Amino acid sequence: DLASLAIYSFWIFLAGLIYYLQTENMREGYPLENEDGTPAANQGPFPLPKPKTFILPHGRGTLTVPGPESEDRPIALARTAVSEGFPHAPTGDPMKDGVGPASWVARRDLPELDGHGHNKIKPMKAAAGFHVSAGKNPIGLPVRGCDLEIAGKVVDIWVDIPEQMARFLEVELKDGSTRLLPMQMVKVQSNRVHVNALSSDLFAGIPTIKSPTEVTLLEEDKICGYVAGGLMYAAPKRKS
Amino acid sequence: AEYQNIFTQVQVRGPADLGMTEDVNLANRSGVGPFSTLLGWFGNAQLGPIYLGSLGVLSLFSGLMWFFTIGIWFWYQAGWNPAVFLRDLFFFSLEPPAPEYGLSFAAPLKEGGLWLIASFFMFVAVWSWWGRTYLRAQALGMGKHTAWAFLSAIWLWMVLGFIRPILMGSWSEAVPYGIFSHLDWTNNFSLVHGNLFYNPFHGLSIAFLYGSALLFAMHGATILAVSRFGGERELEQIADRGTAAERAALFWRWTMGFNATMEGIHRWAIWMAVLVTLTGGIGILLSGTVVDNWYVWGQNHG
Amino acid sequence: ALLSFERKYRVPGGTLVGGNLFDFWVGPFYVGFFGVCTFFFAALGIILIAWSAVLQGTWNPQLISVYPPALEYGLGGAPLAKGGLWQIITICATGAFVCWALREVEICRKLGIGYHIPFAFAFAILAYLTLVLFRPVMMGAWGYAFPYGIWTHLDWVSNTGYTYGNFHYNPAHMIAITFFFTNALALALHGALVLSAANPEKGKEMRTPDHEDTFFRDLVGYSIGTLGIHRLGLLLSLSAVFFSALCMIITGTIWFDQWVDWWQWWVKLPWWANIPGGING
Ligand code: BCL
Ligand code: BCL
Ligand SMILES: CC[C@H]1c2cc3[nH]c4c(c3C)C(=O)[C@H](C(=O)OC)c4c3nc(cc4[nH]c(cc(n2)[C@@H]1C)c(C(C)=O)c4C)[C@@H](C)[C@@H]3CCC(=O)OC/C=C(\C)CCC[C@H](C)CCC[C@H](C)CCCC(C)C
Ligand SMILES: CC[C@H]1c2cc3[nH]c4c(c3C)C(=O)[C@H](C(=O)OC)c4c3nc(cc4[nH]c(cc(n2)[C@@H]1C)c(C(C)=O)c4C)[C@@H](C)[C@@H]3CCC(=O)OC/C=C(\C)CCC[C@H](C)CCC[C@H](C)CCCC(C)C
Ligand SMILES: COC(C)(C)C(=O)C/C=C(\C)CC/C=C(\C)CC/C=C(\C)CCCC/C(C)=C/CC[C@H](C)CC/C=C(\C)CCC=C(C)C
Ligand SMILES: CCCCCCCCCCCC[N+](C)(C)[O-]
Ligand SMILES: CCCCCCCCCCCC[N+](C)(C)[O-]
Ligand SMILES: CCCCCCCCCCCC[N+](C)(C)[O-]
Ligand SMILES: CCCCCCCCCCCC[N+](C)(C)[O-]
Ligand SMILES: CCCCCCCCCCCC[N+](C)(C)[O-]
Ligand SMILES: CCCCCCCCCCCC[N+](C)(C)[O-]
Ligand SMILES: [Fe+3]
Ligand SMILES: [K+]
């Protein structure tokens, strides 16, 4: 019966597909590891796919995956138990050390580029013709942390040139220097910008970038990771 | 009230963005359209430019001819009366030839001929539009994933209006052009074949249709949850995994025991959706050609 | 075992209940208080289904069916074999689902990410409760809820739908289907677009988001963008289920005649109700 054959053949194809799809999703993070970094004995029933290679534009090289996986950074954590499966306690300050919800990945210390080879993200004062076109302009507002103290003032917007969206606020601190705050982690109000993730005393520890007109992928991760980590680690200073 | 990144707080605008060039014929690109602040609360504010070569003009012209052919017949059915037009808009219907004309083209204009004219225009519009999805990707050097996926939608449509009518032996099997009538056709199609709930390909079709909403709710929510680490910049997260892609993977690993990659999730996505119409078109195509009654069929090959 | 980058995220903290009592993992799975609850509700619920599968008397998945209480029982209890198992299994299912979501909230807090995922899942949970709880209570009987059986639940969909004619004519059902269809269309496009950029013609460099915007603008004259498309997928799927639940919550309560006849309010509007011609004159 032709319909019986079609449906039998389809369930076979589907098993091949799910196999294909599961192995394609192993191109990062595998082989699995024990908590100490060595290969785990049990890798699951799916083998690693044959490697593929992405050609990155603008002379940035290639990426071959799967490939040798290394964290390429120290991890300030220690076991809390004598067997696998338990949490790992920060051995120092987890916001400063970049662990837990404050983690960051060692991405390349170059900026992301648009399709023409220019830096994807620029402060708006350096982006010819870019300006605020709708909603409340935050530039000039004071910045309040979750301890309800003022931590600084907005001095610019860092914008995504090819996609024309705001990605960061540049905030000036009491000592004259500035920091980037992720746009998705601030609330623009009529008389202030409010940041629930950080208390005012935590603003100075936000990782700093090395150039006033560009930010690298490595720096964005340290910034985004640090701000998000305040949700957990600044809770003792958050009010209601 | 914590921010959720469903709607934009602050829109910024810059010079109109004219696009990448690669091998595109810039003479066929329009100028840039207006900017919509409304859209900019949710997505991009920029409209245009659009590309309009020969294929695109051909497609737009047949597509409008298809529409206008239906709309003239609707006015005829209204006796040219505007209030009757508006009142009965969803009840009008442009229907295919009666069974006795088979696959021929003899049927009179008012009794199926007009349906075949409209369908011819629709056929040319869709297939020429498919060529656009391939050629626009070629001109930019991109993969042809969009065009292959569009083929899966075209499959079901081809099966409904063309391949199954032909295999069944008459145009009367095809779908009529009307709001309520195409719903009536759909209910009647199931009743005449013994309830599609017994068609195992209709069940798969539903699983993937439900599954697409499942998966897009998951993926869309995940990306928005990690957009505080730039997670929607997915192409660079593929080239250089960030903390956004790692937290996304670990949410799902911790929740349900396995996870995706920033690239692989898009293979889950394209196949979830594509299998809706793939299994769908098979299920419809087998109906009446091979299986007269799915209830009956399930009694024997279940 | 851990993914190669996983250890740095496995810190204490995040839990809503129990402090650090359940703050640990089993292989890849996080546990937490709400994992213990989920496991309990789910284990019990499955046990009772395997039971019900003997009070009815078979071990065939395609036959096991746990029916709700008959309409005569109204909104009251019922003996296990006559609908009481269904009611207990429904409480377990609700508890497993709610606890699955709250466990997701705890995973969100440990990871420093937003709550969007469990928020979305809650829409699925409220569609389920519309069918098994809100609509049956509004109608007066557990018997209007669906049975837990692979094929018998489809039986329920047809019987319920045809009670009102062709169900196609429910206008909230129409909007729900429209969102489902546009969701699948947006999912095919979104997956194809990212992949066509990451996997260009043989030997080419990876394309950028700028190419993805250019592609869609060339194709249709508008590109929603990489933030927008993810917003869109969430909105379309969530709207599909919202209008799904709405289309059923009003069926058999505020509207209970044949849905096709609902549309007469339009046709019978005074200024054209009596103009002859067309289909309805
Ligand atoms: C949603 C509106 C209607 C309805 C109408 C239909 C119609 C119409 C069809 C289905 C189909 C299915 N439905 Mg139903 N169904 C409803 C409510 C439910 C509920 C629920 C708790 O609310 C569940 C779990 C299911 C489950 C299922 C599957 C058996 C099947 C494929 C779904 C799928 O892939 O989705 C997308 C989800 C995924 C891809 C993720 C994986 C989900 C897996 C498959 C669910 C397995 C559930 C298992 C069999 C039973 C519980 C297991 C317990 C441990 C005991 N339905 C209500 C009553 N359902 C189809 C079928 O083939 O039925 C035979 C079909 O044609
Ligand atoms: C009483 C009614 C019958 C029934 C009769 C049918 C019939 C008949 C069919 C389906 C089919 C479908 N059914 Mg069923 N169905 C029933 C009950 C259900 C239930 C339910 C809860 O009970 C559900 C969830 C479904 C779900 C679905 C989908 C899985 C499937 C369609 C996929 C799709 O994307 O189509 C939408 C997508 C398309 C139509 C493809 C369109 C592609 C073309 C190329 C686009 C051209 C555009 C054109 C140019 C116009 C442009 C306009 C401008 C843009 C403005 N059915 C009952 C049993 N169902 C189909 C199927 O595959 O079944 C196996 C089908 O043919
Ligand atoms: C994989 C399964 C899903 C799928 C996939 C899919 N569809 C696709 C694609 C893909 C991958 C495309 O590449 C292609 C596309 O270009 O999308 C932007 C397409 C597309 N799917 C479309 C529609 C569509 N897809 C549907 C469904 C599905 N598409 C599935 C759910 C459905 C239904 C019934 O559910 C519809 C209606 C189009 C948007 C587009 C194909 C366009 C096409 O063929 O155009 C030819 C026609 C013309 C060029 C002109 C037509 C003229 C109009 C009738 C004018 C009248 C409008 C009037 C002036 C106003 C009307 C009201 C409002 C607009 C104001
Ligand atoms: C709101 C948009 C869509 C949505 C979203 C969504 N679903 C989600 C999520 C999200 C965002 C999750 O995070 C969550 C998840 O973890 O996904 C992997 C989930 C999920 N959606 C699921 C299923 C699912 N979603 C569906 C649909 C939808 N999900 C919507 C369309 C459907 C259907 C029919 O369309 C199904 C079947 C699961 C894979 C998962 C939730 C898993 C869970 O809660 O696990 C805890 C409970 C158990 C492991 C077992 C409980 C068993 C019971 C105690 C007994 C059985 C009772 C049941 C009523 C029997 C029914 C019999 C059937 C034959 C009808
Ligand atoms: C204001 O009024 C004016 C006149 C200005 C208008 O413009 C008003 C216009 C309208 C009111 C139009 C309204 C249109 C509709 C209601 C259309 C609705 C359509 C549907 C619901 C479509 C249902 C499904 C359609 C399908 C399945 C079509 C299949 C098409 C085939 C695949 C094509 C096959 C080709 C054939 C038969 C031709 C054969 C000949 C060859 C040479 C190939
Ligand atoms: C319907 C989609 C769900 C299918 C299940 C996919 C296979 C899950 C196995 C994942 C393997 C996890 N592991 C051990 C490799 O890490
Ligand atoms: C959803 C919106 C899609 C609409 C498509 C808009 C195309 C823009 C064309 C604008 C033409 C401008 N100009 C100067 C050439 O006339
Ligand atoms: C080709 C014309 C380009 C510029 C058009 C600008 C449109 C007006 C700008 C404000 C947008 C307000 N609105 C209502 C259109 O959203
Ligand atoms: C421009 C239309 C292209 C030809 C395909 C459509 C064929 C329609 C035939 C209509 C019937 C004509 N006639 C004389 C039998 O009435
Ligand atoms: C690519 C994702 C694959 C997910 C697979 C979903 C399987 C759903 C099972 C539905 C069963 C339908 N049928 C006809 C056998 O009854
Ligand atoms: C088709 C729906 C049924 C799929 C449910 C099973 C999901 C598998 C999750 C397994 C987790 C991986 N593993 C082996 C480490 O447990
Ligand atoms: Fe995505
Ligand atoms: K500027």
Residue numbers in the entry:
A (entry chain H): 11 to 250
B (entry chain M): 1 to 302
C (entry chain L): 1 to 281
Quoted passage from the original study:
The photosynthetic reaction center (RC) of the purple bacterium Cereibacter sphaeroides (recently renamed from Rhodobacter sphaeroides) is a photosensitive membrane pigment-protein complex that serves as a convenient and informative test model for studying the mechanisms of electron transfer, photosynthesis, and pigment-protein interactions. The RC from С. sphaeroides consists of three protein subunits and ten cofactors arranged in two membrane-spanning branches, A and B. The RC contains two bacteriochlorophylls (BChl), PA and PB, combined into a special pair P, two monomeric BChls, BA and BB, two bacteriopheophytins (BPhe), HA and HB, two quinones, a non-heme Fe atom, and a spheroidene molecule.
In two intra-subunit mutant forms A(L172)C+L(L246)C and A(L37)C+S(L99)C (pairs 3 and 4, respectively), the formation of disulfide bonds did not occur. According to the data obtained, the mutations made for the formation of intra-subunit disulfide bridges (A(L37)C+S(L99)C, A(L172)C+L(L246)C, and A(L53)C+I(L64)C) did not contribute positively to the stabilization of the RC but, on the contrary, had a destabilizing effect on the structure of the complex.
